[PDB]
Amino acid sequence: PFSGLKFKQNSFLSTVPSVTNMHSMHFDARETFLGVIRKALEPDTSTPFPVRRAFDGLRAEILPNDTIKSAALKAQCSDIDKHPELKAKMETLKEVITHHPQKEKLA
Amino acid sequence: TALVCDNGSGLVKAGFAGDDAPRAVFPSIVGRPRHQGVMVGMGQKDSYVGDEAQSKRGILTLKYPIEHGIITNWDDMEKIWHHTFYNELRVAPEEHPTLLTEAPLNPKANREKMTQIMFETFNVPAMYVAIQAVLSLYASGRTTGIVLDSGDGVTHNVPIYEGYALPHAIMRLDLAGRDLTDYLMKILTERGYSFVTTAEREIVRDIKEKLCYVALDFENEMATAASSSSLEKSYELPDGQVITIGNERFRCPETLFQPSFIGMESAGIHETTYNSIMKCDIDIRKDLYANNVMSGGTTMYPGIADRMQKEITALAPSTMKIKIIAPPERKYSVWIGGSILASLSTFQQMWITKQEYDEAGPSIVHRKCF
Amino acid sequence: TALVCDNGSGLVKAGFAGDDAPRAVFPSIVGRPRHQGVMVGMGQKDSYVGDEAQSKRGILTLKYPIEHGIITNWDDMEKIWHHTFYNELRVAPEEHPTLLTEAPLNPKANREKMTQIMFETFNVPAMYVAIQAVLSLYASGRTTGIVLDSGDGVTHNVPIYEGYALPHAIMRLDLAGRDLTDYLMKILTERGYSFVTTAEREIVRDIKEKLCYVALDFENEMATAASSSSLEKSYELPDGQVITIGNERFRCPETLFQPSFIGMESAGIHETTYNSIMKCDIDIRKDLYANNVMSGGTTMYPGIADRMQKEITALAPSTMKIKIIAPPERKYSVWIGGSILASLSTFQQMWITKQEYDEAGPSIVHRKCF
Amino acid sequence: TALVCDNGSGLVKAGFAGDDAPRAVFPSIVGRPRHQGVMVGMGQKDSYVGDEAQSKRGILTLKYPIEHGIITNWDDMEKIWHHTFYNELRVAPEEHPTLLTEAPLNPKANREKMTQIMFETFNVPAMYVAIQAVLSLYASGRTTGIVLDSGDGVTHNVPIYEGYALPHAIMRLDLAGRDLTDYLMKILTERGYSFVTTAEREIVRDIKEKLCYVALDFENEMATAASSSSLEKSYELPDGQVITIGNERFRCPETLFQPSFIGMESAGIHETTYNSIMKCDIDIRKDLYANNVMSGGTTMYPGIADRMQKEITALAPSTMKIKIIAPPERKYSVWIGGSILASLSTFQQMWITKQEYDEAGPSIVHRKCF
Amino acid sequence: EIALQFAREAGLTRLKGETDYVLSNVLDGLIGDGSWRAGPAYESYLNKPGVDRVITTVDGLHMQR
Numbered sequence A: 001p002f003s004g005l006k007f008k009q010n011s012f013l014s015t016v017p018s019v020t021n022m023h024s025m026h027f028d029a030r031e032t033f034l035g036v037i038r039k040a041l042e043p044d045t046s047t048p049f050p051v052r053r054a055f056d057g058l059r060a061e062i063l064p065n066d067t068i069k070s071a072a073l074k075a076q077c078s079d080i081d082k083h084p085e086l087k088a089k090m091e092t093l094k095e096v097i098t099h100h101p102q103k104e105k106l107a
Numbered sequence B, C, D: 001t002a003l004v005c006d007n008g009s010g011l012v013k014a015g016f017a018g019d020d021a022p023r024a025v026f027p028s029i030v031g032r033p034r035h036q037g038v039m040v041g042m043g044q045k046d047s048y049v050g051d052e053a054q055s056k057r058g059i060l061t062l063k064y065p066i067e068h069g070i071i072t073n074w075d076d077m078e079k080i081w082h083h084t085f086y087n088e089l090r091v092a093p094e095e096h097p098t099l100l101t102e103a104p105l106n107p108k109a110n111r112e113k114m115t116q117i118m119f120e121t122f123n124v125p126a127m128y129v130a131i132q133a134v135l136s137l138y139a140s141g142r143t144t145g146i147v148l149d150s151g152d153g154v155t156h157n158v159p160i161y162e163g164y165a166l167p168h169a170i171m172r173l174d175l176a177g178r179d180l181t182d183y184l185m186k187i188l189t190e191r192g193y194s195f196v197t198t199a200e201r202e203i204v205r206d207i208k209e210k211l212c213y214v215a216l217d218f219e220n221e222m223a224t225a226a227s228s229s230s231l232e233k234s235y236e237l238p239d240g241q242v243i244t245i246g247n248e249r250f251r252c253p254e255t256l257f258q259p260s261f262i263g264m265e266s267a268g269i270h271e272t273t274y275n276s277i278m279k280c281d282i283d284i285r286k287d288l289y290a291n292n293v294m295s296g297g298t299t300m301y302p303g304i305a306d307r308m309q310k311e312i313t314a315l316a317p318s319t320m321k322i323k324i325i326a327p328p329e330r331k332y333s334v335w336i337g338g339s340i341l342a343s344l345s346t347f348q349q350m351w352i353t354k355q356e357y358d359e360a361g362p363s364i365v366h367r368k369c370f
Numbered sequence E: 001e002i003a004l005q006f007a008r009e010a011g012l013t014r015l016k017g018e019t020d021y022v023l024s025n026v027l028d029g030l031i032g033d034g035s036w037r038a039g040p041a042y043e044s045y046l047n048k049p050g051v052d053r054v055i056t057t058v059d060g061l062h063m064q065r
């Protein structure tokens, strides 16, 4: 689906919270981790522009910065059976993640 | 009315075109909590922007979304811009065309992304990306001169003559205030002072701004500091501890003229300015020599202009008249120029509009903007 | 009042018939900005002419619309003529007959297009194209003599006796001031001074004008320069750098007498004048020998008149009295002659009128002008 | 036998007259440690020459003693020559006549210093300074043709016909590989890649030598690169980082044909060759058009000869047959010609001998050689 | 004047007083004082009093050190 997509290695390491903050009684694990993965999925500038625009639409839809959008997507996926497009988008993004060159660190 | 946002590495200077000063000047930082818990209702806010991050500094890790004039964290840069529009200027960006700035010889994706965000995220009616040295020359009133712009991320000089830039003479050094801040906390360890956190880096930046100065002759100043205590100054840390620094006061800014202090092979800012001038046509050099204009926070050291006057005078032929222009508003010259530029009636046709962006996309920025 | 415009390859001498000197003298150059942008407020005019081009040469590419006496860019030439009338003389060309000049043996199309442009785009009531050597003889107050006219573009000899020209004895030599400027550039590199751009060609021309001189004995000056530094003179460039020039001071003008210096297979100006005289009737040669008239800027080198006497004397029979006439104002002698010519009441019927141009078209210039 | 030392701006090509290729080819660089200390007993030296300087490039500052064909550091040049004779060729210069080379239109002090050092420092029995383009024609085996030699420092044209040079038609542009390397360094910043040190300049030179190529149609290639990634190639840096380069592959060498890219007001190499031919006699231009011979490393770009064929063909009249001769060994053609020249029996009396030198001194070189 | 151009430009008088007999006397005829036996005064471009190290427009584009 995406050929020629490259990522800046270690770009996400700055985004990882301290372990002590992870224990905070109001720590948003889902949003913070999705933020880390979103940063890791930032296309490197060396990626061809048509691919960059193409993928940035995919990760922006699946991993939006905005909390309102992230909460909107969270509800729509609760009944994902009626969203074949999201199924396809999410499947495409899962395939990108599993081929990410730094998947081991992300895991 | 048009918004002017000088998005520097260290500070955000933002405001409305036509005003004499920016309305909102706050650190270009996003801070996130690095400690734990532990009280109900006291942690729902993740991330802090600008002044609020600087005040809660002690419990946060601070990160600059811009390093060396380059946006490295676009998610945090959106937060910085959202804070600027909605919380500091209190404006709806979709009603205001926005002029913003960048250093010359930046990566081209840097302009494209900042155009993308302005049109697609903030829905701005129009935008423009100007060069900071050109804006500084606007602020100086001149149309000729070689600007030396040095802020937090990068120092560059742009020679301009009769309004014509000589791009082959643009110089860049990735050596600016933040490198000087880092060097100072390195040499502060010589006196047993250890600053390691991002918060402590901010306080060391504060020490630099208050106590550091450029020595007119570095060797004599070293001899003076070594032979006496006359150059020592004390500084009170936020917890009441008092640190005293002697020759570190001028050894830190000396890195600008001797970049080998931090291991850099590059030439000093004086030699870089001279090299930029010599790269220009022999006819325009005399005017450039007389119109060296400083801008940015990193040119606010006491004695920087006098040192530059001396250093460039030693490199130029003796018959030239070297003049350094260091306005007291140096730190905002870039924003001032952008405020001037955006309000000129002859500039209203140079905006990138939402319609041109739709037709062409982010690459429209390379065609419409220097 | 008639307008007298001596459009030489190097300079535009323009003014009013009857005056003692041309009102306006400026370089025959059109400059265009070769650099980028970048400031909006200055207006950024797209082209510059004359003194304005010369002062802004640092950021322009300088173009001469006349090459070796021939107009090679008619658009730029029309710019130079519009500048002459409206900006320099501030006259309405519709009200003044215009006397132009050109070197002998020029392409005939050059004459016709000058006529066409003057009548059609400038709507002069009348005009006339004169020969620069003839005008120089007018300015010398003589009716007999061989004029050696050497400006920026071409050197030409015209022998005249009692007002009659011998057109078969006219000599033309495209070796002139501009070729000497280019040669000085070449030999200035021998000392490490590399001038390349057109703006720097103007600097080299300035060096030539005030430091070059003609040597009476070339070998003697070469020996003097080799064995001493007494002939070395310094020159300060616009940026303050000083160049020191030795035998290049007299080697550059020496090309006029040894064209093989620049690879030209032609005799020097001395032997060309002598060859012109010998092509004339034997009964007028004595009077031509005593009436050698120098004209034009390229005859302004110190020592050239004395060198021409030595050279012409070495060629002519010893009983001939060789006299070189080099008035101090020989640089404007051509314009002076045109001023005299256009003033004469008896010349007032020699004008090509607009009516004659209409009936005949531009070809009328060949019939009515030498 | 005789030594042949083709020391250009970038590389030293050295060897023995009569051999088919230089024995010693190494960079013309002197490196000095820019870092500190710190281990005693290490085989540390205060300077490194050539291949060893490249190896330890990481901790050195690299300096070229020759720039734009001119030796600017005579102390570092003497150790470059000491390295050549003693460490690379393993010869005693005291018993070998040595043939040296330089570009045309160099400062005359350059040849004299070369002669002085060879006779006084290295005590060579005889020596000769030849012109690189003439040696290139020797290597091609022709006696007619216009040579375009382009190394690291200078590009020059020398038209020769039947062994006769037309020195008034020699062109020289101080625009060669080193200028192209610096331009590639500049335009690599558009993609975020920063190279500022001399060591990284060497890396960029490596990128240029193996990824850059000349576009046949520059606008077509620009459109191709803008619409697709088929022109993007990758390069692995010494530390393992991989940089992707697109239209910079052909924009870098486009500076040869469009010198305005780097702010030079100059004609491209295609126009300079055509201008050189036109300065030659009309009767030899046809043979020059068919004998354009390229030499030097900067002519090793893929597609440059085809681009020259297209560009000169567009400038010349349609009936002429333009032929570009680009031998695969055109990088060493200059040294090859020197090897041929120095081995001719007919040349052995053209050497400047030691007795000649000590009777005349350094200036002998100007009389004996070109 | 032609003879001295030959000495200057072509080394006609290279052999100084060792110039062969007929050429020497022809030169003596043209130059009675015999000063031609001392070859032409050639200039040296080394250690010139005031010529060092000028940087023009194009030179300013390279400017090492």
Ligand SMILES: Nc1ncnc2c1ncn2[C@@H]1O[C@H](COP(=O)(O)OP(=O)(O)O)[C@@H](O)[C@H]1O
Residues within 6 Å of the ligand: B007, B008, B009, B010, B011, B012, B150, B151, B152, B153, B176, B177, B178, B181, B205, B208, B209, B210, B212, B295, B296, B297, B298, B299, B300, B301, B302, B331
């Ligand atoms: N009075 C001062 N003396 C010395 N340095 C200063 C002073 N004020 C600001 N600076 C330095 O200037 C930098 C900010 O300058 P600025 O022009 O705002 O840069 P930017 O445009 O990148 O935000 C800071 O890193 C700071 O260390």
Ligand SMILES: Nc1ncnc2c1ncn2[C@@H]1O[C@H](COP(=O)(O)OP(=O)(O)O)[C@@H](O)[C@H]1O
Residues within 6 Å of the ligand: C007, C008, C009, C010, C011, C012, C150, C151, C152, C153, C177, C178, C181, C205, C208, C209, C210, C295, C296, C297, C298, C299, C300, C301, C302, C331
């Ligand atoms: N004092 C001087 N000494 C030497 N050369 C001069 C002097 N004044 C002018 N020139 C030369 O004469 C040329 C201009 O002479 P001019 O008679 O104006 O020619 P044109 O008729 O083509 O304008 C210039 O190229 C300049 O180099």
Ligand SMILES: Nc1ncnc2c1ncn2[C@@H]1O[C@H](COP(=O)(O)OP(=O)(O)O)[C@@H](O)[C@H]1O
Residues within 6 Å of the ligand: D007, D008, D009, D010, D011, D012, D150, D151, D152, D153, D177, D178, D181, D205, D208, D209, D210, D295, D296, D297, D298, D299, D300, D301, D302, D331
């Ligand atoms: N294959 C290649 N492609 C492009 N450029 C090259 C290639 N090989 C060498 N060069 C360039 O040629 C220059 C060296 O050429 P050379 O003829 O050795 O110059 P010099 O005579 O000054 O040593 C270097 O600056 C290098 O960048």
Ligand SMILES: [Mg+2]
Residues within 6 Å of the ligand: B008, B132, B150, B151, B152, B296, B297, B334
């Ligand atoms: Mg700034």
Ligand SMILES: [Mg+2]
Residues within 6 Å of the ligand: C006, C008, C009, C132, C150, C151, C152, C296, C297, C334
């Ligand atoms: Mg004239």
Ligand SMILES: [Mg+2]
Residues within 6 Å of the ligand: D008, D132, D150, D151, D152, D296, D297, D334
């Ligand atoms: Mg070479």
